[PDB]
């Protein structure tokens, strides 16, 4: 650097640059130009009564929004020069908490003084850590209602009890209005955690909803969703996804007056025809005598538990013996394993990615280079500015084709969150999702089981395939979802651009969604080969030097002839191959590298490319509130 004054000048320059960036990022949240600071409030324990906490928290000016069940308000103050919008969730209510935690700028967790959180509080807290955490703040409510000898030990006991989830985070206490102002002052001035999926797209929380049907007999009409835009600039040509109800076209954007400005009708845009994005998920264009033989003619309620224990037995069998299949004695193995082949090396033997494709690939979309397309889309959302509705404006959305049910769900209490998608996000493809299994649930999950996906602001049912998460062009199928490994779940779904959180739930019974697994979305391609392996096993019962006679592995003579070119291996590390079948039954001669033990086992692997099942349906039932079993 040299010349001490010059290096101090360099440091002062760099301080000015970084501080300018900080002052940029701090103006965008709860200000005059910016949108309201959204605070979700979640009471983690069942003893916690939320209403007196939020009555503490409402005191600036309060403008109470109202719904049928959920009661949330608007707080506005010039003492902090800040506009907050508070919402209230109940843990255990999966869709509501997850829906308005993927829009909230700050989560406020409310804690019991005696115990940390409820068991359902742990369930919600697992789902919230897994689907993306915003800025969060801890608060406790009952410390003051104790003698001080108890207060010191209670606060130390909580500080011990929360460190497994919040390791070093200061927990505030909320009993008074002075502490309410102190907590508001804390929530205003914090390092904001940025979630990337919120940042790249144009999301919206619905503050008011109006519906007018085009035909009531059709039960469809245009819907008017009014709120503050939050993400990027909202362009009308792109489609609009309502989180629980699917993605569809929006007609008109207009800007009414901001009803709650911090310090106290016009049509902005109507959608063009050619420049609009089309609603197309799939591909639209589709001399022998009488008695002689041939041998001489050569010369011339409880059933569910039964399937449950069966799945337990199959899981215990497919970890002792990973892919072993007993060959059927009645069906010929060249017919029951007709589509299978043997690979010399699962790493280096070739497989054509386009060899035998089903009729379901003729319905999805593929990418010529997904990395280049994603980089271009992200460059054109950051570096290019579009003349839509800018961030922070109180706007109203006229969407065209939308069913009735949304409206009365909005009257029930369900929040409506709508986000504007990127190009090529309505279209179907094959999503690959890396995922690992929650310690909370230990039910065996088979391969093509129907599960519920939360893949980055969407929510759907589908049947995945589980694969090894490898770097190779082939990836082996897992028949079960293993407890501690990381696996790839592969399924048909509309394309989402990563980064995106992924949650996997199972419909348990009477409407309970059990969180079984969590992870993130990896690159989308239907070129990822998933290979199901079958390992056939036989017993070498006549062992000579470097040659053996093996039985019980096939049962016909030409079964051995069909699977002749496949290399056999051995449980104790030997490697050999088939020479000849000897008996009319499935006895075979096999030559090996070294002498085999009588204790040993011969086995070969067969491979076929397995494809996911088209079972995608966007409708997903609303859960019941969650509880331990």
């Amino acid at each position: 650097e040299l010349s001490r004054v010059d290096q101090r000048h360099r440091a002062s320059q760099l301080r000015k640059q970084k501080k300018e960036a900080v002052l940029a990022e701090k103006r965008q949240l709860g200000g005059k130009d910016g949108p309201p600071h959204q605070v979700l409030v979640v009471p983690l324990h069942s003893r916690i009564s939320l209403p007196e906490a939020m009555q503490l928290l409402q005191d600036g000016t309060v403008h109470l929004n109202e719904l049928g069940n959920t009661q949330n308000f608007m707080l506005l103050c010039p003492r902090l020069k800040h506009r907050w919008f508070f919402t209230s969730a109940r843990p255990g209510d999966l869709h509501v908490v997850l829906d308005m935690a993927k829009v909230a700028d700050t989560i406020l967790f409310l804690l019991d003084p005696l115990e940390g959180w409820d068991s359902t509080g742990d369930y919600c807290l697992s789902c919230l850590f897994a689907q993306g955490l915003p800025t969060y703040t801890l608060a406790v409510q009952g410390i003051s209602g104790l003698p001080l000898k108890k207060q010191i030990d209670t606060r130390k006991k909580l500080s011990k009890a929360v460190e497994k989830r919040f390791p070093h985070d200061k927990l505030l206490l909320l009993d008074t209005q002075q502490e309410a102002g102190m907590l508001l002052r804390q929530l205003a001035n914090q390092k904001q955690q940025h979630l990337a999926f919120r940042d790249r797209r144009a999301y919206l929380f619905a503050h008011a909803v109006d519906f007018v049907p085009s035909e009531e007999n059709n039960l469809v009409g245009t819907l008017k969703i009014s709120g503050y835009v939050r993400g990027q600039t909202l362009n009308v040509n792109r489609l609009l996804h309502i989180v629980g109800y699917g993605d569809f076209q929006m007609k008109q954007i207009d800007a009414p007056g901001d009803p709650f400005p911090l310090n106290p009708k016009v049509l902005m845009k109507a959608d063009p025809g050619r420049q609009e994005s089309l609603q197309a998920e799939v591909i639209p264009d589709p001399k022998v005598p009488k008695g002689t033989s041939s041998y001489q003619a050569e010369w011339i309620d409880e059933e569910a538990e039964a399937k449950m224990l069966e799945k337990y037995k199959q899981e215990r069998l497919e970890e002792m013996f990973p892919d072993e299949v007993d060959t059927p004695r009645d069906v010929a193995a060249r017919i029951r394993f007709q589509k299978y082949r043997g690979l010399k090396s699962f790493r280096t033997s070739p497989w054509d990615p386009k060899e035998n494709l089903p009729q379901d690939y003729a319905r999805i979309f593929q990418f010529q280079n997904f990395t280049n397309t994603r980089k271009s889309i992200f460059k054109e959302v950051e570096e290019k500015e579009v003349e839509g509705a800018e961030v922070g404006w109180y706007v109203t959305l006229h969407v065209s084709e939308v069913p009735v049910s949304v409206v009365e769900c909005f009257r029930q209490g369900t929040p409506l969150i709508a986000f504007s998608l990127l190009p090529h996000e309505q279209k179907m493809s094959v999503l690959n999702m890396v995922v690992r299994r929650d310690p909370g649930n230990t039910e065996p999950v088979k391969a093509k089981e129907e599960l519920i996906f939360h893949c980055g602001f969407r929510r759907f049912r589908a049947s995945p395939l589980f694969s090894q998460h490898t770097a190779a062009d082939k990836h082996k199928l897992q028949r079960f979802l293993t407890a501690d490994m990381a696996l790839v779940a592969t399924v048909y779904a509309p394309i989402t651009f990563p980064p995106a959180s992924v949650l996997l739930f199972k419909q348990k019974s009477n409407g309970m969604h059990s969180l079984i697994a969590t992870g993130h979305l990896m690159s989308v391609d239907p070129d990822r080969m998933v290979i199901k392996r079958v390992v056939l096993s036989g017993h070498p019962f006549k062992i000579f030097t470097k040659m053996a006679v093996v039985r019980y592995m096939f049962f016909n003579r030409e079964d051995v002839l069909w699977f002749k070119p496949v290399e056999l291996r051995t449980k104790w590390g030997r490697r050999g191959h088939i020479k000849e079948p000897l008996g009319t039954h499935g006895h075979m001669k096999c030559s090996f590298d070294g002498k085999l033990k009588s204790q040993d086992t011969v086995l070969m692997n067969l491979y076929k490319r397995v494809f996911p099942k088209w079972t995608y349906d966007p409708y997903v039932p609303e859960p019941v509130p969650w509880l331990k079993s």
Partner: peptide
């Protein structure tokens, strides 16, 4: 006349392609 290896010569790799989105 066919076995496990030769029969893979009968699989044609040009039929059911998904639609390609160009870059």
């Amino acid at each position: 006349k066919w076995d496990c290896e030769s029969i893979c010569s009968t699989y044609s790799n040009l039929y059911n392609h998904p639609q390609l989105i160009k870059y």
